[PDB]
Structure formats: structure tokens, C-alpha cells
């Protein structure tokens, strides 16, 4: 037969845990991916989160307390038999920050297969002779992601053809930023807490008397468990859960990046209106002048106020805090799992029978096409240039306004027209700092 | 590695035909099917559509229209390069109407796996002796439904142990019905174009393969119909193949609106036609399964089930559907809701104390095999609903039947087969040839 | 990306279960299914097992016996935790030997699905108008199969166009039978242990996760027994999930040696035993479909085909299978061979000139949906064997059966019920209940 | 349900190619890939081919050829009508040989993805201090293919803790090889002809008159095509030739290993000998003397005489050159596609209810475990390692004598035992001379 009658996506984990574990393909609406016939691709806008990584030390701290009293107790049973042969995942507290290296969900493989996948797609946007800069926060998994895509896809001629340029995160860089600051509730309030919690609570101590294991020892053994897909194939950890704490878990990671990343926290869209902005720049300036391919990398919270400040994936209302709001589009799974991005393609199409000649614009969520809205006049859904304009100019918010960014920081981003051609920065060349956050290297 | 990172259940054409092709299961927000540990169900109301049909007669002369000037022209190129060997899939007009016999998506094998399956589920809701009673509303099509769904339940005792019950589709039964009526004195739904820019690619590239035929964008919707029909009759469907994977967003969205407004939320009086069925369902509940009975398998229309969804206020997407254009990501996906053989099913589940819910009795909806959460109303195990809260918003929020639809006062004003019904075995086995285009029926 | 690198089918336990559990199709040689271009199919003559049944009678004893063991001791722990809330599968012993009729695997589903599937593949074979013929083997689980395969096939049209003629399973109807007769006057069928060294590890870890139960080597063979026969009747087994992919590697081992010797190429008999069906269909292939007729679907059970492929000569062990180990690669794999509902389809193709053969008639054999080339007889379209050099191949190299079985010279010496039946359709639905372990049977 | 009843594998072009195709699976007959309970892998000796590749230059200058007369001719209809926007894959002249950097199953991905799987998979076998020596015969595109490997293996570390040794192919290094040479039939004879061929040369000249292709065009259309997914995604030349043509394809490559490579030439095994007897060595020796960890990398010609002499995958009677032998076990697919490895594990075991305590020999070949014959009595179908010596001390041919090697070449491998720890190899230092192929950096 032609097509399978068998639904089973939605019960994935990899939907179920918030921004922790492995990149996942975001849900498709069903509009094909490639460029619509009589299209084709100018012009590519991406911006990738880190890949894969271990755990942050806050989180690290947290799991290993919640750990401590799962080992306070004899030969393991029920499902925490595997116990009694497991090792934690995380060599040493000096891996904390880091990308994983091991594992079919490694987040250094993940950037070097992106890479090579991207060169296929977009090859032909470069001509093989060109120095293209490519662009990362300085923070290092950020930067190790960036190298290992840079590397996969200008592959052979990476150490003379891409040319690392990495971006400061402090907020001294004002909107010459890749991670932009905004300084003057919900999320400092947050629980991280949800009734099916309580369920896994009573069942784990039922099995394994002993362990006085609450509902935050819980949330933080599937934070654990989350993270453990980023250095192994397989994690035991999350089949000692039920279907519905996972469905609770994403959840509850839902609401923290809703509330203190995206539009939960309005002053969100204005954050993300710098890089919203600056691609539109580059977009109406087009390939010839600027450049055809504009790879950056960042963090998850760099790219959700991206989304918010183009008004796309906006819940209809806050999502509640005590119970799952069924359907809701901040299914963070399908927006910023571990290596998630956004790539915006900049379309140059010839007449078809529904839109004229013209450039059109097409965004990119993991894999899946994302309809800018009520924008969908041109070919594959994408939205005509001048609307797309439009559009941008007449809703992002202010960033330097908004964000009371000193009158002394650049007012403006300027790296993706004033960048260096240098290939120093390509390969790392000292060993990864212990717990290593902000880098320049 | 324990999971794909491929995520491709959304490209599939199944879910972008509105209600014409073959079932699939509903997409899972990923609450576990099964009861939750500490539970049962203790009682089952399922509503199912009649299962994989050929297209109705008016459909089948449009879709005969449109292959007319498809046929027009020497050897077929391109897309339509098939057509040098290929056959229209309706045996003859008087097929219209019926359910399909062949392939893997045959209407009827779609009832009896159905019926199997809910017998390994639900089979410890019957003792083995008790003559249990079936519904069907009174059409040809849901009739052989309900027949063969029944069959594939009782197995060996189908003929002793299960009783249909046919359900008259007239005005006269009143609120006494499967397929309640409501008079039409108040649009939206009869201005429907059928029409999106994506048909205009369609025709063109069709035209350009192939000169000659002169199909416009309505020869297209025509022939779009046609290809989510023959999977209905097919394995496989070339004609679905011709179109793109745009097209085909297109259609199903095309699709949707004629739910949306003919047969949905977009047609205020629906929820009252619905009410019936919703507030009906709710008083077995109540009753409970030791009184009432555990088992109710219904068999309707895709039209009869919608109305139950907006009753429910469920899938109820923010905003009034743009004609215009997709409005992508909103709730009323109908591959999602009613496809054929589509089904409503809810489970009243018997729970013991759990470490978030009282011991006590909960409600669960499950469409097309997927848990649908009742709203707000997540507070019991597998965000269920408890029993005494479903009753309350119920109460609440379903409008009044009779009052909304001017039923006549002469006609019943309550829905009573549940409990009202025969036990005899008659109407179980066809005994008539299935009439040309055989539709309304009482056998 | 066009291609998953991920090659998981190995795995399946439905292919480590030899002839138990559910039906599954056998594992391609990448052959396309469909006709060949400029070919058709003109003839299709099937022999399909009876669909997913319940153990037999001796089995479930065994199964029961085993499974005292496992009840004789407080709350179940480890694998065996499911068995705190779980109750054996057969609703009571008339139930062994009967088709099952729950569940996704349920045995009559299959045998309906089957029918519809062969419904939009030779559909054209049928011209609406013909009183087709069917034969089924005197076996009840046999009879129901085949009223549900063709009920699938005919539909609408099953109670008038089709006609069940059924063939006694007794000896007296000599070389006219689905199921032929062969004297033992002649072994290591017989001394078969039905143990490999991987039972042993099994018992040691049940019994160490339970104690008390004292489980055997043997009282895990039936465990094993019980747990494939389970899906059967139930979507899911938890008991399958008990022992081990190594396990279960070696139960499926266990199980083909049992067909391997006592109904297949190990005992030098079966060939002349499944020379009757092979010859028979040869002379239906040789006569034609426009005199002969163009659909044969029979029904028969397991040891029935598997003495058809070893007459044929196809998957035949270069040596004799090893009783002590697993003899890994080895053709005789009975998931790929006769799982439940397996089938054996001879396709009798018309085909135009190609650029590598010329106009004329070809053989293709399918089994369980995977195209069986005929050892070296290769050169037809889709690697199908030239009607003529089929018909020399079995003519030379099929045993006599009469002789080599020592058939009474007062029994039919030729099969005879292709051509000569009846066309009432008397026998096309069942008339009284299942008797208690129904074996035999005529009606 | 618990299980499909769609067996759908078998239909996979990857296993109809021979081994110019993507990397794949093989064929699973059931056995468990991890360690049976009881035991753990404490040696592993592994030889995986080069990645996914470029053809050959021969290669491609008959595919060249081909498409000249396919380019003979207003635009492309039926089948080819892709032709009408579609380019060759191969950059320039140059790219033969090269291991390839676009796509899934980009050749040096494929390496970077084994190797991040091993680390977690072995990853117990490698202390984090210990300098491991890893070997590639001296070729480009293997020293490619094991450099990425090691770089996926040892990640942060693979600069200070992996020592690339590159083993020169010269017949001049006898049995100190990875690649053994041995001078002094069918083979040279090969047509690289079946009659499915001759249906799709009628087909593709039907619709698309004017190319005058004939059955050895289609040949190198189909060896270009099958090479065609080592750079792209998807190949549309691959869906312009049937199931049927497909299966005759991978049936005419299956010949060629079988005859070239294989038991089919009766000197294969003696070559094969080589390995067999030296890792053989290295698991009698175990893994406290002589390492724990052997990760060589080397080409599909070198691993099939491996397989010869062991005696594994051997058919009953030499593969018929005039038609498909259906169900025999020399399925290339399943044996040496691109990046096929075979990995030997020394599995130690304490006793089981079917074994002593122990140490016992496990043979996996591309992720599925292969039995060695009938010494399948230890755990997971494992031999034991006393049986296993006697079993190849017994029939392993002698290599020097069979092969006529030279008193003054060495006799016997030394590189296990004698090999540097300098890091200078570990990555490339200039670039991929042209048609690279015989190389020591
Ligand atoms: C495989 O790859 C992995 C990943 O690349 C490698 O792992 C990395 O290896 C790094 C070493 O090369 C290791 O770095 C060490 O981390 C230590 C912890 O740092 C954190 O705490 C301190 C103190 O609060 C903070 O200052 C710091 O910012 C962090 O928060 C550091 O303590 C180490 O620093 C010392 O060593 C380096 C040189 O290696 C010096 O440059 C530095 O100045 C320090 O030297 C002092 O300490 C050393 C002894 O460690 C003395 O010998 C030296 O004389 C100095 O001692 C003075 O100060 C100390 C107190 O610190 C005091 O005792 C003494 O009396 C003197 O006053 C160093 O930075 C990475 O963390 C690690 N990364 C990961 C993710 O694990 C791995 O090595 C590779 N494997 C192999 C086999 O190569
Ligand atoms: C396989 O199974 C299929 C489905 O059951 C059978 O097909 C049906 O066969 C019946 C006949 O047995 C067909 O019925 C015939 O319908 C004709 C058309 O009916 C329409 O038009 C009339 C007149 O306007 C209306 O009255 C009616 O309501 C419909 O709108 C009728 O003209 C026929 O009537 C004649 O025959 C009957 C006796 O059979 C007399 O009573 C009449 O007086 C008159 O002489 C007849 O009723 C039916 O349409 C078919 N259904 C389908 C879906 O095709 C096959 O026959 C069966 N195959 C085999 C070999 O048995
Ligand atoms: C749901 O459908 C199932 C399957 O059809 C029905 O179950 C069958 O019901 C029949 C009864 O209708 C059962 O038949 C009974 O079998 C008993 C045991 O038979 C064995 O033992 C005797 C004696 O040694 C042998 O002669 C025989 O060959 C068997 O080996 C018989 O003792 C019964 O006989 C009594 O009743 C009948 C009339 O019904 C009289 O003629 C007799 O003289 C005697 O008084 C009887 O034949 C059958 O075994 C069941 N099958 C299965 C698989 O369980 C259910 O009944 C049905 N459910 C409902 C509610 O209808
Ligand atoms: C948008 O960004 C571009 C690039 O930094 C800048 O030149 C331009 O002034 C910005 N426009 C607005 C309205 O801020
Ligand atoms: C709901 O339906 C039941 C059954 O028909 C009926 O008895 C009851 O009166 C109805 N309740 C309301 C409010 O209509
Ligand atoms: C083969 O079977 C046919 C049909 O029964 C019979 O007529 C014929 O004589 C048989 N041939 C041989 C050699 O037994
Ligand atoms: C035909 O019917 C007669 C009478 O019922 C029966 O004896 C005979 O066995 C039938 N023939 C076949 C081939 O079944
Ligand atoms: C096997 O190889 C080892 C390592 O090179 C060598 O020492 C030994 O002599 C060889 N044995 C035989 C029989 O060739």
C-alpha cells in the first residue's frame, strides 16, 4: 500500500523534553521543502543553536543531589534494575557547558552532518573560490558548533575558505550582537512542577524503598535522563517514566522558555527585532551585494525572541502554569531542541501560475517550512519580498529603546558586513576550559 | 539509537484530504493510549463513521465531467503517462454511494479490523452470554459498517450475541436519532468556491504535459477528489502522484472549510445538533455501566460527528477559517478528525487513588486512537476528566437542541435507543442486493 | 535522504517463531512484485494455511503444565512482573484449534484482509457474472479461513458468486486431496528433543528472578510456545518480552527443525506428497485460463505447503539441518516459510516480447508477497520461468506419489476437484457453532 | 501491535549495488549486537573500509562516455526528464578517488559518525591517558576516512591521544601490510553483462530517441548512479532503472568481489591469512599486553579475502556468470559497501547456564553479529577463543609461500606491536593531490 495509517510522532521523547535532548526534525504542516518549481534559492540566512551538550554546572549540581539519594540505598529492582550496572554520563564536573563527543546524538557530529547536508543543498552558492566568513557568539560550544559545521561544509577547503569570526556576548557589543542585551516575573516564579511528578515520586520509592524522592528529585532525574541521549545511543533513565510524566516534562520546559525567553516576556520580540532586522537588511540588499551565505550560530534563547519578534509560533494566550495546554504552538521540541535553527531562504522565482516574477521569502524550522503567517502569496507558501518588508518594518519593536541600551554601544549590527577574512579562529587551539561558558576561542 | 530524529508523519497525503480517503490514526499529543496504572475502563461510547466508500452520485458526475476532458486526446505524457493503463476505479454508477470491497483500505475490512481490535481492548466488557445492542443510523453505507464492525467484535457470536438496531435518518425521530435534523432558516457554507491559487499550478502544469485537455482549476479540485477516492477502492493511487505536495496542503484545506462551515464551528447551530449525542452520552455515564450497560458502538456519518466535537467544545480553532488562504497550524486538520472510518470513542474510566487524583470515576475521550484532553479539564490520571467536573461543563455549556433546531413539539424530544431497543438478531446479515446507489436504508 | 541505512527486519521475533505466530511477509530478494512490463497475470492458482489460531489441544495441555509451575507462588518480580495482572489467553479449551478472531493478528481478519488485498490484484481475473469454485481442506480453523478470504474476494457478491466445495483430510480420497496421505512404514522427526543450550540460560533466569517456580528447560520451550501463540489473539505480548533476542533466535531454530524433518526436505517422502498439488497445477497452467479458469484459491494447512516447496525443489538446505546448533543462513527459515496465513501463489504471466525474452507464457511463484525465483529457470520478465522449461523441470524431476507413498490402487489416483465441483454456495457460511477443539470437519 | 508484518528491507537499492554505494546495515539474522549478560567486550580489532567515494578515474571516464551519448540530444522527456536540470557530481577531474565531503552519506561524515558511535560503544576501552595508535594503509582516501574516525573516537583528545601510523601499500612491506600483495583468471573475463540490462538500453533509447545506448552504457549509468548518493541525497538516475535492472546491478558487482576478491580466487584466502593469524595473535596475547584498542582502516578488497579465510560467507559453489543466484551469501551489500567494517570483539564472560567463565570471540560485520560457523557454543553465539585458534591455526593458508613473497620482504606483520605515538600524521598538512590515490599523508 501507498501510505502507512500509522500516526506515532507525537509520542516521541524527543518531543517531550524541552530544549535538553537531541535535535529532532520540527513537525511538518506537509509544504515540501525543496524550492518550488520555477524557484530557486539566492540567498541563506541560518542561525543554529550549539549542538548537543552536558548538562550546565547549576543543573549538573542539581542532578547529582537528586543522584545522591537514589544511591543511599543493596541490589537495585523494579525499573531501576539497569542501577546496578550504570555509570553517570558526565566524566567530570569539567565537562559541564561542553559539547558531547560520543554517541549517534553527539553534538559535534550533529554540526558536522548539518554541515555536510547544507553543502548539498546549498553548494551552489558558493563558488569555490570565495573566503565566506561564518559567524559565532563567543561561548564555547557555541563556537565548537560553529567549526564543526564550518568544516563540514566547506570540508577540503575549510582551513582556507571559511573564516571564523566570533562575536562577544557581552552586552558591551550593544546590537552588534548575536546574543543582544535587555536589562528593565513569571519566570523567576516558575515551580518546574506538575502533578504526574507526584505519580513518579510514589512509584520510584514504591519500587526502591529508601530514597525519599520528591517531585523535584524527579524533575531532576528526567533532566538527567534528557541530557543522556546527548552522550549515548540508548537511556534506561527515561523508560523508568511514564509517557505521561514525559508529556508533564516538556511541558514544564515549555513555560520556562516561553516565559523567560519568548513571548511570555514581551520585552522578548525587541531582543530578537537586531537579528530580525539586519537579515531583512541583507535580504533586500541581496546575494550579489551582500553575500549569499550567512551561517551564525548561538544559543536557544538567542533564537526563540527571533520568533517572537517576527510574530510567528505565538501562543493565543500565556500558557497556563498548572496543567499542559493541549496544542498550543510553543512545543519547544519543534523550536529549539539541542542543535535547532532557523534558516531563511531568500527565493528568486519566475512567474507561476499564482505570483509574478520575484524575490520571495521562506523560513525554516528545523527542516520544516514555516508559513509566515498570513503571508503565503508566493510559490511554496513563501511570502514576496516587499510584503515581507512590510511587515518587519511595521511590527518589530525597538531594540535600543526598549532594552535601554547605553547611547555609548553600537546602535547597530555591523558584522555581517564588517568581518574578517582570517582563519585562525577555524580550529580550536587550546584544551576546553573547565566548565568553559564565554570564550573568544 | 533509542529514537529517529526524522519527523515525517506531517507530509503525508492521508492527512491532507479532508474526510475523502482511507482512516488514520490522529496525530498524538503523546498521552499513552491505555488506561493509566491504577485504572479501568469500565465503559465504552464510541460513534465510528461508516468506513472507505466509493464518491457520492453528484461527486462521481463532476469527477466524470473532468476525466472526460482529461480523455480528449494518442499516447498520455508526463504525470499522466499512467493513463495509457489505467481504468476508473467505480465499477458503474450504481456503486456510488457504497462501501468499498477491494484493496488494503476496503471500507468493510476497515469495520471488521476495527471491530477485532476493540474486542482485545474492550472484550472484558462482556461476559460472553449478554445479547448486546448495536446502533446504526439508517444508510447503506453505515449500515454494512456497523454490520461488519459488529461482526469482527462478537466473532463466533455474531449472530446470537450482538443485535442491530437501525436508526431512521428522518426528521420525525426528532432528538430520537443518530443523525439529528435541523431546519436551515439562517451561508457560508453554500458560498464555498472550492478554490485556492495552488489549483491554478495544478491545471497549468497538467495542460502543458498534455495539451489538449483544457482542465481548469475546478477540473483539478475534480480530479483531486478523484485520486483521494481510489486509495478508497486501491493500494495504490497514480493520480494522487500528478499533483504536488502543495496541491495537495491545498486541497485538504479546501476540504477543511467545507467541514468548518458546512458541518462545524463555523455554523453556529451545529453545537446544538450535537448536544444530542453529548448530553445523551453523558446521562449513560452518569447512570454507569452495572445500570446502563458497558458497551455502545454507534455507527453514523463524518457529519453526525463533527456537530458531537463543537458541542463538546473541542478542536475549536480560535477564529472563523480564512476562505482565502491556509491557515496553517490551526485545529481543524479533518484528516485528523474525521477521515473515513473516523471515531469519537469515550472511555469512563473506573480509578483507584493515584498520587494527583482521588479513587473515584473519570472520563476520557480518545479520537481516531489518540487521547483528546478535555480542555482545561486535565485533573484526573491521564488527563482525564472526573466525572462530576464533565457533568458541570456539560450542563453548563451545551445548547439546547429543540430550541435551536425549532424541532416540533409532535416529534421526540429525547433520545431513548439506548435504552430502548430490541435484542433480535434479524438486521444483523444483509438479505438484498445493495440498491443503486444505495443510500437512505433500513436494512 | 532516499534511503535508511538502518537494516532492522533480522530482528523481528515474527520471524523467530517458525510456524506460531502471526503471518508476515516473507523477506524479499529486492524482486518487484507487480507484473513485469508487458506482462500480465492471466491465471493465479493459491494455497493458503489457515489463518491465526489458538494452540492445539496437546500444546495447550503442555502450555497449561508449564504454566502451573509459573502460578505456584505473592507478587511476581522482574519480567514476570506483568503476570500480576494477566490472564492466560484461550477462553477455555473448546477454544484450541480455533481461529482466532481478536487482536490486529486475529486469524479471520487475516484471512478477510487477504481477500480484499487479492481483490484489487486479480480482481480483473473475474468478470462479475462467473460462479467461482474455492476448495478448502476438511478442517474447521481450514473452512473459516477460507469463507473469510473469499467473502474478502467477492464481497458484495460472495453468497452467489463463489462456491466452497470442501475436501475431506481422509486418506480414502487417495491423490484427490488438498492434504495427500503418505504411510510411515520408513524417524528423526520422531526423536526431535525440542531443546538448544539457550532454554537453559532462560530458566536459570526466570527462576532466579521468581524462585520456586522450578522451570525446565522444557517448561521454557512451552513458555515460549505459549508467549507466540499469544499475539494470535493480542496486539502486544509481554511474555515474549521475557526471554531474550538469543532466545528467541534459537525457539525459531527449534521450530523450523520440526518442519524441516517432519513435513519438509528431511523426510525424503514429502516431495512425492507434494508432487500431487505441484502436478496438478502444472496441468492447470498447461490448459490455459480461458478453458481451465483463471482463479484457484485453496486452503490447507502448514505441512501442506511445505512438502509443495520441497517437491519443487526451492529452499532446499544444501545438508541436512544440525539438531544441536543453530545452522545460521540456512534457507529453511519457517517465518519466511509458512508463518500463519502463509501462502504459496503461482502466477501464470502473459507477456509480449521484451528485449530478453520472447511473446509467450511465464511462471512466477509468490510467496508470502515475495517473488520465489525458480532456482535456475531465471530467464523470463521479473526472473520467471518460461512455461515450458517449467513444465519440463517438474515433469523430470517431481516423485510419483501414489507409488512412493503406497496409495491403495482403490483411491483416486488423480486430483480431480479443480475440474470436477460443485457451484452451490451451501457451504459458504458457517451453519453450527465451532465444536469443542473442532478439527475434522465438512461444514 | 508489537510487531510489522511489512518486510520491506530486501527491496533497498543499498543492498543492490555491490559496494560503490552508501554504507548500510547488514542483514541481521537475529542475534543481539551488545555483549550477552555475563559478559563485556575487553579487545576490539577493527578494519573498516575507506568512506563513501568519487569513482575511480577508469570509472569515470567510462561513465563520461556514457553520458556523451545520453547528452547527444531539445529537452529530455519520460524518465530523464530530470536531465533537463540536473549536473554531474563529480567537481572536476580531480575529485576520482576522493573520499566525498556533501550529503548523508558524505564518506568523511560516514567516518566522523563510526567513530563518535564506537567512543560510546568501546569508549570503557580507552582510559582518557593512554596515547592509542590507530593504522591506515598509505591511500588517500582511507587516511581520510581514519582520521576522521579517530577524530570522532577521541574527540577533544584525538591531537595528543590518537597516533595515525599510515602503513605503505608496497609489496616491498610483505606481511607487514594492510593491504597484501600476492602475484601468481575468471575475473579478467568478467562481461559485466545480464539481460536486464538489454530491457532497460530498450527503454531508456524509446523514450528519449537518439542516444543509441546499449546494455554496457546502462551498465556504467547505473555504476554512475550508485555513486551518485556518495555526494547528494537522493538520486533521481537511480529511479530511471527498475527493481529488476537494480537486482541484476548489484548481482554483476557481487561477481566481481566473488571473483576478484573473494573465495572465488583461490589465492584470496592466503592473502587474508595475513590478519586472521596476526589479530588472532593479539586475542591470544589479550588486552593488558598487547592493547585494547585496534581501529584500522583500509579497502573493500582487503577485507573480503579476510572473510575468505576465516571461512565465513562462503557460497556453496562458485557464483554462475550468466544469471542471478538467488539466496547465495556473497550479497556485497551485506559485506563490503562503502565504509563496511569488520569488527572483532574478545568478549570476557563469567560462566553462564551454557558456558564456562572465559574468553570467547564475536565477529561483527557492519553492526550485525556474524556466527563463525558451527563454533557458535559460547554466549550470544560466540567461539570459544581456544577453539577459535585451533579452528584458524588449522585452515588459514600460508600467505609468503601461497603468494611467492620474497625471503627479503617481512614475513610476518610487526606494526600491532611496533608503531609510533607522534601525532604529526593525525591531520592533513597539504592538499588532495589530484586523483590522489597512493599516498603516506
Ligand atoms: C582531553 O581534553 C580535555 C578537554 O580539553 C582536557 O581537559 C582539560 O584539561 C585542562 C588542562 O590542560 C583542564 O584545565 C585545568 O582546570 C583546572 C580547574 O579550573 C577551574 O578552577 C580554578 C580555581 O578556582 C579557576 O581559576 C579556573 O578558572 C576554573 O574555574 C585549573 O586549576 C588548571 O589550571 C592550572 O593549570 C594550567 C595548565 O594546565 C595553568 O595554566 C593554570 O595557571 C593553573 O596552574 C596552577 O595549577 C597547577 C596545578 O593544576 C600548578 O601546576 C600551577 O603551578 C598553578 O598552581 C597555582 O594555582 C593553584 C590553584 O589552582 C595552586 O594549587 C598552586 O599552589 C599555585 O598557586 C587547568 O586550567 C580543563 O579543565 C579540562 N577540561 C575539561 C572539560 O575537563 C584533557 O586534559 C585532555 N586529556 C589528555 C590526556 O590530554
Ligand atoms: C453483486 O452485488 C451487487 C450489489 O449487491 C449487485 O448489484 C445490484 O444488483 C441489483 C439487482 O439485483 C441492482 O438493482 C437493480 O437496479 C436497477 C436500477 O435501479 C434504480 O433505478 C430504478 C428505476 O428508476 C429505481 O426504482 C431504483 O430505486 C434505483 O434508483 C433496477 O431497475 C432493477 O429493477 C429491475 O429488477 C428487479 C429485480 O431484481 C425488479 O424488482 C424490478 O421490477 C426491475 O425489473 C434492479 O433493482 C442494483 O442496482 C445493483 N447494485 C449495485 C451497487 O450495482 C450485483 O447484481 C451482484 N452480482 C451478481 C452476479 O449477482
Ligand atoms: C459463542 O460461540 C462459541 C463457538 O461457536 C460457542 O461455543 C460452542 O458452543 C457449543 C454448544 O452450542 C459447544 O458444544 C458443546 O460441546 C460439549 C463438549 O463437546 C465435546 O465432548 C463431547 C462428549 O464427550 C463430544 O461428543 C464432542 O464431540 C466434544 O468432544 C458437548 O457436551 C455439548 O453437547 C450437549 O449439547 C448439545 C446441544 O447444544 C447436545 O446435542 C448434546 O446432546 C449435549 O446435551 C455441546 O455440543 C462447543 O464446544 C463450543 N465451542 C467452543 C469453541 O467453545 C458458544 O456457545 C457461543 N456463545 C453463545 C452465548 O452462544
Ligand atoms: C536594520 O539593521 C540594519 C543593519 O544593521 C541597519 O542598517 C538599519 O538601520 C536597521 N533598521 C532599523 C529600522 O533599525
Ligand atoms: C439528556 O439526555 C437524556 C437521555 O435522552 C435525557 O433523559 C435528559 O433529559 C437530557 N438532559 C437535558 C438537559 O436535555
Ligand atoms: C498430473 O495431474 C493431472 C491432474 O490430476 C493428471 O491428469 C496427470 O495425469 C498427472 N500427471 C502425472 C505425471 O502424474
Ligand atoms: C459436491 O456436492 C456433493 C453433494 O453434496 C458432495 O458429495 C461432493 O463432495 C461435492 N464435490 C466437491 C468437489 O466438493
Ligand atoms: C601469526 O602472526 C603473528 C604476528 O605477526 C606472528 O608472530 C606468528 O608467527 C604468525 N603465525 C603463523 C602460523 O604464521
Redesign the interface.
Known amino acids: 500500500?501507498?501510505?502507512?495509517?500509522?500516526?506515532?510522532?507525537?509520542?516521541?521523547?524527543?518531543?517531550?523534553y524541552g530544549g535538553n535532548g537531541?535535535?529532532?526534525?520540527?513537525?511538518?504542516?506537509?509544504?515540501?521543502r525543496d524550492p518550488?518549481?520555477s524557484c530557486e534559492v539566492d540567498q541563506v540566512i541560518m542561525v543554529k543553536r550549539h549542538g548537543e551538550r552536558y548538562p550546565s554546572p547549576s543543573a549538573g549540581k542539581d542532578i547529582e543531589e537528586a543522584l545522591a539519594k537514589v544511591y543511599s540505598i543493596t541490589e537495585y529492582?523494579?525499573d531501576l534494575?539497569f542501577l546496578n550496572d550504570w555509570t553517570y554520563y558526565v566524566?567530570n564536573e569539567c565537562y559541564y557547558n561542553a559539547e558531547t563527543?560520543?554517541?549517534?546524538?553527539?553534538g559535534?557530529?550533529d554540526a558536522?552532518?548539518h554541515g555536510?547536508?547544507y553543502?548539498?543543498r546549498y553548494?551552489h552558492l558558493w563558488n569555490?573560490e570565495t573566503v565566506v566568513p561564518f559567524f559565532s557568539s563567543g561561548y564555547g560550544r557555541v563556537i565548537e558548533t560553529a567549526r564543526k559545521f564550518g568544516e563540514?561544509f566547506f570540508?577540503?577547503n575549510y582551513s582556507t575558505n571559511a573564516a571564523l569570526n566570533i562575536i562577544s556576548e557581552s552586552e558591551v557589543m550593544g546590537a552588534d550582537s548575536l546574543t543582544p542585551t535587555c536589562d528593565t516575573t513569571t519566570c523567576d516564579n516558575l515551580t518546574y512542577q506538575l502533578?504526574?511528578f507526584?505519580?513518579a515520586?510514589?512509584?520510584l520509592n514504591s519500587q526502591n524503598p529508601g530514597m525519599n524522592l520528591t517531585a523535584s528529585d524527579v524533575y531532576n532525574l528526567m533532566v538527567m535522563a534528557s541530557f543522556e541521549?546527548n552522550?549515548?545511543?540508548?537511556?534506561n533513565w527515561?523508560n523508568a517514566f511514564?509517557?505521561?510524566e514525559?508529556?508533564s516534562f516538556?511541558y514544564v520546559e515549555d513555560l520556562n522558555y516561553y516565559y523567560c525567553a519568548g513571548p511570555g516576556d514581551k520585552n522578548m520580540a525587541a531582543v530578537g527585532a537586531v537579528y530580525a532586522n539586519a537579515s531583512l537588511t541583507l535580504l533586500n540588499q541581496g546575494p550579489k551585494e551582500a553575500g549569499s551565505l550567512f551561517f551564525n550560530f548561538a544559543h536557544d534563547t538567542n533564537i526563540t525572541p527571533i520568533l517572537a519578534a517576527l510574530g510567528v509560533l505565538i501562543p493565543?494566550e500565556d500558557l497556563?502554569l498548572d496543567?499542559?495546554a493541549?496544542?498550543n504552538?510553543y512545543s519547544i521540541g519543534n523550536i529549539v531542541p539541542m542543535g535547532g535553527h532557523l534558516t531563511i531562504e531568500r527565493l528568486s522565482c519566475q512567474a507561476?501560475?499564482?505570483s509574478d516574477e520575484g524575490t520571495y521569502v521562506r523560513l525554516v524550522l528545523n527542516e520544516?517550512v514555516l508559513?509566515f503567517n498570513?503571508c503565503?502569496?508566493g510559490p511554496?507558501?513563501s511570502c514576496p519580498l516587499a510584503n515581507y518588508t512590510s511587515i518587519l518594518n511595521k511590527n518589530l519593536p525597538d531594540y535600543t529603546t526598549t532594552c535601554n541600551v547605553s547611547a555609548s554601544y553600537p546602535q547597530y549590527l555591523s558584522f555581517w558586513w564588517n568581518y574578517n577574512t582570517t582563519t585562525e579562529l577555524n580550529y580550536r587551539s587550546s584544551?576546553?576550559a573547565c566548565q568553559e561558558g564565554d570564550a573568544m576561542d
Open positions: 500500500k501507498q501510505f502507512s495509517q500509522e500516526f506515532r510522532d507525537g509520542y516521541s521523547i524527543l518531543k517531550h537531541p535535535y529532532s526534525e520540527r513537525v511538518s504542516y506537509g509544504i515540501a518550488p518549481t529492582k523494579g534494575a566524566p563527543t560520543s554517541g549517534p546524538y553527539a559535534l557530529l558536522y552532518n555536510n547536508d553543502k548539498a553548494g569555490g563540514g570540508g577540503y502533578p504526574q507526584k505519580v515520586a510514589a512509584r541521549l552522550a549515548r545511543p540508548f537511556s527515561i511514564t509517557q505521561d514525559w508529556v516538556g493565543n497556563p496543567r499542559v493541549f496544542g504552538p507561476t501560475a499564482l520544516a508559513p498570513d503565503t502569496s511554496g507558501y584544551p576546553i
